Design a protein around this ligand. Structure first.
Ligand code: NAG
Lengths: 23, 40
């Protein structure tokens, strides 16, 4: 892979996603 | 009052698997859906 630039997280995780796939 | 939950992806189910198993239906169905799209 401050000065008012904000980075955000996503709605789904690197984990849940890995759980969707399994299905 | 208000709450915050972890997001459940769906209801746990399972497929009864076995090396000599099958699932075949008996009754069909018809089900209308929708799909809205832009054109202009
Ligand atoms: C099929 O489904 C319809 C309604 O869902 C029902 O009226 C009918 O009896 C069903 N037929 C069989 C063979 O289960």
């Amino acid at each position: 892979l401050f000065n008012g630039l904000t980075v955000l997280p996503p709605l789904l995780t690197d984990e849940m996603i890995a759980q969707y796939t399994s299905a | 009052s208000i709450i915050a939950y972890t997001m459940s992806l769906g209801a746990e189910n399972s497929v009864a698997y076995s090396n000599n198993s099958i699932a075949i239906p008996t009754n069909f169905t018809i089900s209308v859906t929708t799909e809205i799209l832009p054109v202009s």
